[PDB]
Amino acid sequence: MAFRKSNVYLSLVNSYIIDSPQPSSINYWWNMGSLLGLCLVIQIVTGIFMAMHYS
Amino acid sequence: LTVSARDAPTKISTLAVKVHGGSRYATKDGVAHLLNRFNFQNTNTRSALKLVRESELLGGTFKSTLDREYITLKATFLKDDLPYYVNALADVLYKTAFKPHELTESVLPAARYDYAVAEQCPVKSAEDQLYAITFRKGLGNPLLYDGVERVSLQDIKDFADKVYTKENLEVSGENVVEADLKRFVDESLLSTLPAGKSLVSKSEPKFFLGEENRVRFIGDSVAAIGIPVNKASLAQYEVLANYLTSALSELSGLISSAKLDKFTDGGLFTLFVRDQDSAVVSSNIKKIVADLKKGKDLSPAINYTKLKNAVQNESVSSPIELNFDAVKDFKLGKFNYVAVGDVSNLPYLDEL
Amino acid sequence: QSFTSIARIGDYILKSPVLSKLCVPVANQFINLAGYKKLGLKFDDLIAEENPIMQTALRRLPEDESYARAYRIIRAHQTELTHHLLPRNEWIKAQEDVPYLLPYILEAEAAAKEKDELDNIEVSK
Amino acid sequence: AEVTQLSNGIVVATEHNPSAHTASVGVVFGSGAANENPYNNGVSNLWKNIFLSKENSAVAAKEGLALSSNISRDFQSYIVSSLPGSTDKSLDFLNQSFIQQKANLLSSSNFEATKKSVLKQVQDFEDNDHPNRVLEHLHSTAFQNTPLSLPTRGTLESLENLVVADLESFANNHFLNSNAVVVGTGNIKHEDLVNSIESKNLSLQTGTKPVLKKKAAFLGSEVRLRDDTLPKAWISLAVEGEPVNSPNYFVAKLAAQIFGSYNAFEPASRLQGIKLLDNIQEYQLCDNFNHFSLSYKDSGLWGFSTATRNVTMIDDLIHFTLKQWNRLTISVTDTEVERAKSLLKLQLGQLYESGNPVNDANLLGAEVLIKGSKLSLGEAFKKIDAITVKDVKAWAGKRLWDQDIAIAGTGQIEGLLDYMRIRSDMSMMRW
Ligand code: HEC
Numbered sequence: 021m022a023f024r025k026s027n028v029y030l031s032l033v034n035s036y037i038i039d040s041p042q043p044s045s046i047n048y049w050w051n052m053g054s055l056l057g058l059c060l061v062i063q064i065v066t067g068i069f070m071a072m073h074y075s
Numbered sequence: 076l077t078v079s080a081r082d083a084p085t086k087i088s089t090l091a092v093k094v095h096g097g098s099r100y101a102t103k104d105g106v107a108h109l110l111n112r113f114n115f116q117n118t119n120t121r122s123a124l125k126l127v128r129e130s131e132l133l134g135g136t137f138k139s140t141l142d143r144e145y146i147t148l149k150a151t152f153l154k155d156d157l158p159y160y161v162n163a164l165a166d167v168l169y170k171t172a173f174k175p176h177e178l179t180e181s182v183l184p185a186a187r188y189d190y191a192v193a194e195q196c197p198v199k200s201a202e203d204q205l206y207a208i209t210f211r212k213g214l215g216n217p218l219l220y221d222g223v224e225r226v227s228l229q230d231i232k233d234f235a236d237k238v239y240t241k242e243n244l245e246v247s248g249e250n251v252v253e254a255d256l257k258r259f260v261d262e263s264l265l266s267t268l269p270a271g272k273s274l275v276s277k278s279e280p281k282f283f284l285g286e287e288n289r290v291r292f293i294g295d296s297v298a299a300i301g302i303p304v305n306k307a308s309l310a311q312y313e314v315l316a317n318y319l320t321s322a323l324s325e326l327s328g329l330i331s332s333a334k335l336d337k338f339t340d341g342g343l344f345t346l347f348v349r350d351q352d353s354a355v356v357s358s359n360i361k362k363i364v365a366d367l368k369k370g371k372d373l374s375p376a377i378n379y380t381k382l383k384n385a386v387q388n389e390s391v392s393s394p395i396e397l398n399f400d401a402v403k404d405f406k407l408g409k410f411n412y413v414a415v416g417d418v419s420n421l422p423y424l425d426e427l
Numbered sequence: 428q429s430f431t432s433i434a435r436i437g438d439y440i441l442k443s444p445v446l447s448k449l450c451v452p453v454a455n456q457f458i459n460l461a462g463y464k465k466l467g468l469k470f471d472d473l474i475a476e477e478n479p480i481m482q483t484a485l486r487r488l489p490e491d492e493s494y495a496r497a498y499r500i501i502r503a504h505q506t507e508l509t510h511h512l513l514p515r516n517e518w519i520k521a522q523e524d525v526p527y528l529l530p531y532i533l534e535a536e537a538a539a540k541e542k543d544e545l546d547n548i549e550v551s552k
Numbered sequence: 553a554e555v556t557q558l559s560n561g562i563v564v565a566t567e568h569n570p571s572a573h574t575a576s577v578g579v580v581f582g583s584g585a586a587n588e589n590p591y592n593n594g595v596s597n598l599w600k601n602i603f604l605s606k607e608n609s610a611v612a613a614k615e616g617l618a619l620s621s622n623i624s625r626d627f628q629s630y631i632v633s634s635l636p637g638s639t640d641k642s643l644d645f646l647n648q649s650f651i652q653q654k655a656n657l658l659s660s661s662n663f664e665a666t667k668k669s670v671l672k673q674v675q676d677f678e679d680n681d682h683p684n685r686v687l688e689h690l691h692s693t694a695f696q697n698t699p700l701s702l703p704t705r706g707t708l709e710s711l712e713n714l715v716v717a718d719l720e721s722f723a724n725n726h727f728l729n730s731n732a733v734v735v736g737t738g739n740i741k742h743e744d745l746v747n748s749i750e751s752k753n754l755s756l757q758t759g760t761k762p763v764l765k766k767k768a769a770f771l772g773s774e775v776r777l778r779d780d781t782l783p784k785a786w787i788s789l790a791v792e793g794e795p796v797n798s799p800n801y802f803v804a805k806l807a808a809q810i811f812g813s814y815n816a817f818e819p820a821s822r823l824q825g826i827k828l829l830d831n832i833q834e835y836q837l838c839d840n841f842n843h844f845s846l847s848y849k850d851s852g853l854w855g856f857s858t859a860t861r862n863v864t865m866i867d868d869l870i871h872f873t874l875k876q877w878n879r880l881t882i883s884v885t886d887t888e889v890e891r892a893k894s895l896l897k898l899q900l901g902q903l904y905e906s907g908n909p910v911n912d913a914n915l916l917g918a919e920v921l922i923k924g925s926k927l928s929l930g931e932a933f934k935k936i937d938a939i940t941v942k943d944v945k946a947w948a949g950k951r952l953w954d955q956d957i958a959i960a961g962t963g964q965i966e967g968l969l970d971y972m973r974i975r976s977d978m979s980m981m982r983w
């Protein structure tokens with residue numbers, strides 16, 4: 021089978037982000053979740069760099 | 076060790092080694108099948124893999140067919156590569172490894188698939204039942220392996236010992252120069268094969284009549300009749316089959332197929348009526364049996380049965396050819412019947 | 428809310444000529460505003476199926492109705508994703524908007540309720 | 553080995569072979585299903601069926617003649633086989649049916665009994681012959697609203713609405729002289745046949761030409777005939793191939809031989825020198841597959857067909873197969889090409905030289921109708937052996953690399969991913 025499916029780490033990525041079967045009709049309201057993950061990343065990255073200069 | 080041939084200006088040659096080892100001679104049920112499935116496996120000097128890889132680069136393929144009487148090892152290839160395929164075929168007949176793992180991993184699976192394909196076609200289940208009742212143990216032997224009686228690797232080896240001998244096989248190269256062919260055959264390992272005996276019996280098989288078998292089957296229903304023919308009375312049955320399978324006969328659209336299996340010591344005529352529902356199968360065969368009892372022919376299909384029996388350019392060694400231009404009438408004595416399918420709604424040998 | 432319960436209340440309203448003439452017209456207007464018929468759906472196609480009653484019911488549905496429900500559902504998703512409605516001549520008509528799955532659902536709820544009753548039957552000597 | 557062809561009033565084409573026991577004679581018209589309309593689709597198949605009618609067939613059986621017909625896309629053919637001596641009586645039956653009985657075959661009792669037979673015939677096809685059914689739909693979507701899209705057997709709806717007049721209308725527009733070629737194969741000489749033809753005069757609708765149309769075109773698309781009740785998935789996928797009389801006609805056929813055909817149950821098949829087999833046998837991605845390079849007058853299809861019971865891994869089947877095809881543009885090896893040459897010759901030989909003259913007629917007839925002649929088997933081999941790795945790469949980089957595809961399938965194809973996923977695999981990422 022394809023490597024993205026056989027590898028222990030990549031298969032997680034494949035099942036959640038590549039081959040994950042989505043209902044054909046979801047609308048833009050279903051885009052908020054990815055936006056929340058992105059927000060989480062922005063908060064963490066910017067906070068760590070600021071922590072470097074914070075007392 | 077008959078070495079036939081027939082050159083030509085064409086680019087594709089076809090070596091072939093007919094061998095009298097079909098189910099007719101099989102010592103144990105399906106052993107001929109297993110052996111046929113074992114050909115082209117590993118030899119003692121060349122693996123099945125290498126044989127294929129080598130022949131592909133040259134430009135030729137192999138194939139091993141099974142008959143009720145034969146086991147043919149054919150090889151199609153480009154003309155000028157003749158020696159290679161002669162030795163390949165020689166190698167198989169003289170020294171195939173017969174490893175226990177080749178049995179379990181390639182032979183048994185391939186044979187199981189063969190039996191599976193055949194177990195799903197009702198006409199073939201019938202055709203098998205026909206042979207088994209007419210010739211109760213000669214040509215009525217099971218064609219394919221099904222495991223009813225044990226068959227070890229040794230049994231397959233023993234059977235190969237009997238059947239693979241110089242006095243029981245015939246080389247036959249189509250589109251090849253007989254000169255070089257005989258030269259290569261004798262120069263190869265064919266001549267080293269321990270020539271045993273020819274199991275080809277001339278005496279007519281002890282056939283039976285008025286026998287019937289009924290097999291319950293899920294799918295299309297099929298009613299069939301089988302008639303044991305004589306060594307000389309087979310030319311009329313040949314025209315009969317081609318008559319029933321032509322626009323001349325009115326009842327040609329009431330049957331699925333009809334043929335004559337020509338052997339070396341006789342033959343067998345078969346008639347197949349196959350359809351979805353039992354009602355149509357009953358009427359169609361009941362009509363045939365009635366119209367054949369009040370037989371007729373007048374030989375109008377004499378030029379047709381002669382033309383259709385000539386389109387077989389691979390069998391330029393057929394029995395009688397001018398025997399057709401003789402008899403012109405046909406009746407219908409005792410025959411054999413087999414009901415397959417919706418049995419409870421199918422005719423018996425009585426009401427026919 | 429069980430379909431047995433919706434049927435109880437609904438049938439009571441449908442029988443009484445007082446309520447029947449008052450509610451049905453309201454209900455009819457509610458159904459048209461819902462809009463599912465413009466997507467080619469029948470109300471029964473809209474029932475949430477992720478529960479045992481609905482699975483038992485859908486399992487028992489004859490083939491022809493099953494293939495039909497499948498086509499209607501697929502056609503609805505495709506139309507929804509294109510942000511259009513079907514051409515008016517393709518809409519489901521009121522005569523067609525029949526409760527085809529309802530009898531199978533009611534039957535399964537009754538069977539289920541009886542099992543629940545029998546598994547908990549008390550005995551008096 | 554000789555391809556003789558001369559024109560006097562009609563174009564006569566023959567190929568003799570003395571070792572042949574029988575001789576086949578027939579007329580091959582330069583028009584097939586590709587000349588029909590969406591509405592009279594199935595008329596050619598219908599013609600073939602009356603030509604083989606119980607009545608017309610019995611007349612030839614008494615005389616000792618056997619009938620055979622074949623409806624294709626670019627052409628159509630009616631053949632009569634006979635013994636080497638009755639080579640004259642075949643022409644009597646040929647003329648008697650295309651001029652004398654061109655009104656006796658079309659009776660309101662024969663036509664109806666025949667129409668009822670092609671209806672049960674075409675219905676049986678659609679209901680059970682899934683691989684050919686899928687291949688037919690592949691042409692249908694690949695060449696939609698174009699001549700090559702029409703199926704050869706015609707459609708049930710256009711068939712049941714067909715009448716005697718439609719047959720006539722077609723016959724009077726395509727069964728013309730300028731759109732015909734008389735072919736003879738078997739053992740008879742060219743001079744032997746042409747004399748019996750140039751003997752009987754009469755032109756019959758001479759100077760008349762068939763109607764024209766619009767050029768065939770490939771459109772990347774798909775048709776999915778999902779059916780979860782079937783026990784397998786049958787799929788066919790292809791790119792725009794090569795038309796006959798194309799410089800890359802042979803490069804294309806060789807390319808298809810590289811991947812060849814396969815059958816998981818045949819021990820020998822599992823051993824072929826095909827790299828794709830290492831990938832597909834591990835989890836048994838399919839029961840069988842076969843590549844092809846279909847060529848027609850205006851276009852062709854290059855791709856493969858496959859059948860499988862591994863319904864949850866169809867995406868791996870498609871993915872590995874397309875990754876292999878990517879190789880043709882960038883890394884096909886000398887030995888793969890050489891293996892293909894040898895196997896292509898072997899198959900091309902087995903076709904052009906079988907023990908059946910009726911096959912020879914169809915091959916000869918079809919070729920002469922398009923290029924006015926037939927390339928000798930020995931001439932082909934010269935072209936085949938001259939192909940280099942550089943040729944295959946230039947071809948693939950034009951026909952396979954990042955090119956649209958056409959897909960068709962039936963059975964349990966829920967696992968066959970969307971178009972774009974398949975289409976994306978027609979190439980690879982690179983720096
Ligand atoms: C150390 C890593 C770090 C992480 C992880 C982090 N922060 Fe912060 N955050 C800080 C620091 C440092 C400050 C003070 C600097 C500032 O005021 O922006 C801060 C301040 C804030 C403030 C005050 C903003 C203001 O007005 O100045 C908010 C609100 C906030 N964080 C929200 C979040 C949220 C929500 C998350 C997580 C989802 C998050 N933070 C994760 C370090 C972090």
Ligand SMILES: COc1c(O)c(C)c(C/C=C(\C)CC/C=C(\C)CC/C=C(/C)CC/C=C(\C)CC/C=C(\C)CCC=C(C)C)c(O)c1OC
Nearest residue numbers: 036037040042050051053054056057058060061064065068
């Ligand atoms: C079924 O439906 C789905 C669905 O399943 C998915 C997966 C998605 C896609 C969305 C996602 C997968 C969102 C996922 C998000 C997360 C898992 C967030 C994880 C968050 C983190 C913050 C990771 C932690 C990171 C760090 C520690 C790195 C920061 C530090 C750095 C760079 C060190 C810097 C220091 C130096 C010295 C240079 C859909 O959109 C969707 O609907 C359409």
